[PDB]
Ligand SMILES: [Ca+2]
């Protein structure tokens with residue numbers, strides 16, 4: 770295929786009394802090399818910067834030897850007023866660190882472009898490139914509902 774990077778759960782409930790929450794990411798079935806998957810915390814109704822939570826935007830490094838992955842996010846103690854709040858974890862465009870030399874041939878303008886994420890919506894030609902790159906899996910969205918300490922299994926949807 771290319772890459773299958775999806776969350777095991779699209780919604781996760783974590784306590785506000787927790788330190789680090791970790792979420793399981795499923796790895797590509799074509800793990801034959803090193804692939805970088807950037808991710809970021811969309812604040813939403815939470816506040817990053819160590820305010821309400823410790824926001825994170827970095828890169829998950831997948832390898833042939835490195836299996837699975839967890840996004841480790843730090844939750845902070847409330848600074849403003851307390852509510853159950855939530856932040857979205859989304860991953861970006863994965864890229865092969867080992868850039869596959871696909872022999873297309875000499876072409877005009879071969880620079881470091883390809884900086885756009887998964888965005889081939891109207892541009893069909895960018896799909897050619899995305900086809901030779903890894904992409905995401907099924908559901909890439911993680912709604913982390915950080916529920917203030919009560920008890921778990923209570924917030925059932
Ligand atoms: Ca707060």
Ligand SMILES: [Ca+2]
Pocket residue numbers: 785846847850851852917
């Ligand atoms: Ca709180």
